[PDB]
Amino acid sequence: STAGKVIKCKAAVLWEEKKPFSIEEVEVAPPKAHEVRIKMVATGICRSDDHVVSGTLVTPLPVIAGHEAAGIVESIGEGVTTVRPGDKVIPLFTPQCGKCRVCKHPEGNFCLKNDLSMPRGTMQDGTSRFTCRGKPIHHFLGTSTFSQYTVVDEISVAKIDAASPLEKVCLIGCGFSTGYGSAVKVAKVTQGSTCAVFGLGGVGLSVIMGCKAAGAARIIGVDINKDKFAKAKEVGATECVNPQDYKKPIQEVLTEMSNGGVDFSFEVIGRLDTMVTALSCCQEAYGVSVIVGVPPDSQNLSMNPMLLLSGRTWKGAIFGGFKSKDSVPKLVADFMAKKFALDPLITHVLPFEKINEGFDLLRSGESIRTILTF
Amino acid sequence: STAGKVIKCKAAVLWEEKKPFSIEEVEVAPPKAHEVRIKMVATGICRSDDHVVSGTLVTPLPVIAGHEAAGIVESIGEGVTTVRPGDKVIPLFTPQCGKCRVCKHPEGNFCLKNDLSMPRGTMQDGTSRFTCRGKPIHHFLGTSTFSQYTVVDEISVAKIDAASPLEKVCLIGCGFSTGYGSAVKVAKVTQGSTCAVFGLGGVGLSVIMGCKAAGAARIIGVDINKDKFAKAKEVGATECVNPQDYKKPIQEVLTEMSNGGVDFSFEVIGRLDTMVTALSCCQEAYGVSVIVGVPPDSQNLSMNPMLLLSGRTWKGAIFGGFKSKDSVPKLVADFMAKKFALDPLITHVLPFEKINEGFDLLRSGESIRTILTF
Ligand SMILES: NC(=O)c1ccc[n+]([C@@H]2O[C@H](COP(=O)([O-])OP(=O)([O-])OC[C@H]3O[C@@H](n4cnc5c(N)[nH+]cnc54)[C@H](O)[C@@H]3O)[C@@H](O)[C@H]2O)c1
Ligand SMILES: NC(=O)c1ccc[n+]([C@@H]2O[C@H](COP(=O)([O-])OP(=O)([O-])OC[C@H]3O[C@@H](n4cnc5c(N)[nH+]cnc54)[C@H](O)[C@@H]3O)[C@@H](O)[C@H]2O)c1
Ligand SMILES: OCc1c(F)c(F)c(F)c(F)c1F
Ligand SMILES: OCc1c(F)c(F)c(F)c(F)c1F
Ligand SMILES: [Zn+2]
Ligand SMILES: [Zn+2]
Ligand SMILES: [Zn+2]
Ligand SMILES: [Zn+2]
User: Fold this and answer.
1) Can B105 be counted among the known catalytic residues?
2) Least CB–CB distance from A108: residue in B272, B286, B306
């Protein structure tokens, strides 16, 4: 039995950038007040985890990464009221404190307690629950799901349906909810509209799913890897285009295809150039473009503000605009009610010990989501 | 007595950038099919007219500028159905053809027949109705209101109330409608919100008017000319700040003042740096920033897309987002019913022949709107 005790378990530690994860024993402290210790069941490999490895995202190292996951509560600290031992849960990489001005705002979800903006790599109290070889190890986004056990703040966990298949619903922890919400909530895609989706990975496919759910008449997938096209069409793309096939810039191609610009465009890659291209390809007077991708740290884009003066709307969002703790249980309930599918996103299922192999599949272009099972 | 005939009249011709207007005789051709010839009554001096002089805004020269005006129809070409001789009218620098995809869209106003994006300086048919010293003179935005008579396409004129005071309602042709609409229609400012308005000229004062009308609790005016602050407070600013007074960048100042960022910001100047500052000062998760100012030709801004990824919305608009021909008569009607005031914008009145003095007043910082009377 483990409650109140330090757990020794296996985790994937990233000691420095641009190296493989190291799978080894860590010590996980018990939860303090208002904290929750979770036995992990499944975690997905999101491109944002790879950004930590590549240096695209800067966060304190060494670190236990991972943010798209599901597990079962092992124990709770004093004062926890929203989960109990035995509950199925999804960690929330965007917290929902319920108290800050963002949480109180009808359209805000980027809770001020987040550890994304100015990452500290800690619990809310500024300390870590992880040690490895006698050294403290940083948390990632208050989640750190690449471990058999993690400790999260109560504001960073949601209880979900006890009958949930955790090996599927872990995707509601990041990639599905992000893409789907980006379409249905952030963009507010309309019936009959034309959409362009740049990047056809797990997140972009989820954007397509949302655009189709919203009733878009045309959904144009854009990727430089044509191997991504078949699955994009399966989940709703009406056409796919590879910028490499064209002599002209793809914004011009997409403007021509849409007879003057698309209604909604989405950048779901993480490149400055495609952010500007995506904005440009939406119709100049009434188009909307949503940035979903995470670009390289500290780099600025260049753009002509006449693109906006004519009437375009440019926005971005974290986690599909969803208030995380309110939304995750409902999304799981909707999944259980067959309102959307997750299997199209899952291309590979590997034991947790094969994390590096899972990352290699992503980097090679061969996978959408690999789910790692503990 | 002049129908079908060439009219010789005085106009303000701009032969060269960075030079005074030349008030001299021009020949104004009669209207062709679907054109309207207008005897001008009053025209305002908008900073965008000055941008033509300074080269901020590139349009073919030589030119008759002017776009904020009101007059009386002198004659109509074949097939005109929406105005008649003797009607009071406002020229529409943003046309409303009623047929293009933008005109048909519920939120679009930047009609595809505009001459703003890629100016040709002609009538819709690609020709000019103006001759001076035997030489063809370009139009500006299909309006060319710095002339005793102009000819406009039917899609570029609106009939207004016969009892309208033209020396006031000319401001509905640009500055008032732009600022007011930017707040009430484009931003959709909410009751109780905090707004920041960069630039306290005629357009920014009109933005303040709209924010107040929408029920904003705080309206922070920002200008480097503190002489602008008294009128900004008269029309609704709750506080004014001069960036030059502060050691820190004004986005940081405004974030502090608003306890974490404003709900709505407006760039109403035309500088790349203030466009980025205005975006930054709105709250990172749910803030909205609207670009109103006209940027220097062909220049790109630089910004970090993380400003958007957190949840900000960035947009721009021409003419306050109003569909021009539908909206201008309604705005005039509302003015007549005292639903908004125009006098706070009018600081100087001059005869048309003193146009250059009117521009001097704008450039010195002394005026908001000078109204020229023909
Ligand atoms: N905003 C959020 O909350 C959020 C959530 C999840 C992921 N992300 C980011 O979203 C992005 C996509 O994540 P993912 O779906 O896991 O990644 P992914 O599975 O690597 O998919 C990216 C796709 O982009 C394609 N691609 C690469 N370069 C180009 C190019 N020049 N043009 C067109 N296509 C190109 C690539 O072939 C691939 O199919 C990443 O930057 C993530 O970090 C953001
Ligand atoms: N989008 C449209 O449809 C539209 C319509 C009308 C005007 N405009 C543009 O809107 C802008 C404002 O026009 P206007 O009100 O007639 O001009 P204006 O009267 O010149 O007002 C601009 C104000 O900006 C102030 N200012 C200048 N530099 C700074 C600075 N660095 N920081 C803070 N304040 C500063 C300046 O002191 C002045 O009071 C111009 O760029 C116009 O071209 C756009
Ligand atoms: O994939 C979700 C995700 C993001 F959207 C980020 F902006 C980020 F910094 C990060 F670490 C992350 F995991
Ligand atoms: O002041 C209105 C106005 C604009 F908003 C422009 F973008 C422009 F190019 C122009 F010529 C103009 F007059
Ligand atoms: Zn919060
Ligand atoms: Zn992710
Ligand atoms: Zn039109
Ligand atoms: Zn103007």
Assistant:
1) no
2) B286
Q: How many CB atoms lie within 10 A of CB A158?
A: 26
* Cα B198 to Cα B204: distance, rounded to the nearest angstrom: 7
Residues of B with CB under 8 A from a CB of A: 101-102, 105, 107-112, 117, 259-260, 272, 275, 283-286, 291, 294-295, 298-306, 308-318, 321
User: Is B199 annotated for ligand binding?
Assistant: yes
| Partner-chain contact B311 A109, CB within 8 Å | yes
Q: Which of B170, B174, B195, B281 is catalytic?
A: B174
**DSSP code string of B67-131:** -SEEEEEEEE-TT--S--TT-EEEE-SS---SSSHHHHSTT----TT-SSSS---S-TTS--SEE
Task: Check the annotation: does A100 bind a ligand.
Answer: yes
Record: fold of B179-317: Rossmann fold (3.40.50)
Buried b (16+ CB within 10 A) or exposed e, A282-314: bbbbbbbbbbbbbbeeeeebebbbbbbbbbbbb
Q: How far is CA A84 from CA A75, A92, A101, A167, B112, in A?
A: 7, 16, 28, 21, 60
Residues B267, B291 contacting (CB under 8 angstroms): yes
Q: Is-contact B178 B187, C-beta < 8 A?
A: no
From the CA of B174, how far away is ligand 4's center (Å)?
Answer: 9
Of the partner residues B107, B302, B309, the one whose CB lies closest to the CB of residue A302: B302
Reading the block at residue B93, the tokens are 């620098």
Give the residue from B46, B323, B95 showing the smallest Cα distance to B206. B46
Nearest to A301 among B109, B272, B305 (CB): B305
- Hey, is B211 helix, strand or coil? helix
Residue A104 exposed, middle or buried by CB count within 10 Å (0-12, 13-18, 19+): exposed
Nearest residue of B to residue A320, measured between CA atoms: B311
Q: How was this structure determined?
A: X-ray
**Same fold: A1-178+318-374 with A179-317:** no
Secondary structure of residue A302 in the 3-state scheme? strand
The span from the CA of B45 to the CA of B355, in Å, is 8
State in Å: Cα B298 to ligand 4 middle.
Answer: 14
C-alpha to C-alpha distance for A226 and A222, rounded to whole angstroms: 9
The pair of structure tokens assigned to A198 is 């740049």
The structural domains of chain A, with segments of one domain joined by +, span 1-178+318-374, 179-317
Active site residue A128: no
Give the torsion sign (CA, B283, B285, B289, B295).
positive
Which protein residue has the closest C-alpha to ligand 1 atom 21?
A: A201
Residue nearest to atom 1 of ligand 4 (CA): B48
B138, two tokens = 């370009």
How many angstroms does the Cα of residue A154 sit away from the middle of ligand 6?
20
Name the minimum distance, in Å, from the CA of A264 to any CA of chain B: 14
Can you say whether the dihedral through the CA atoms of B257, A108, A154, B306 is positive or negative? negative
Residue among A306, A322, A323 with most chain B CBs within 10 A, to mutate: A306
Opening angle at CA A158, ends A154 and A159, nearest 5: 115
Q: Which SS3 state, helix, strand or coil, does residue B176 take? A: helix
B116 Cα–ligand 8 center, Å: 12
Does A311 contact B316 at a Cβ distance shorter than 8 Å? yes
Residue B204 in tokens: 């920014």
Q: Report which DSSP code applies to B182.
A: I
Reply yes or no on domain B1-178+318-374 having CATH 3.30.1510.10: no
A14 backbone dihedrals φ, ψ, rounded to 5°: -105, 105
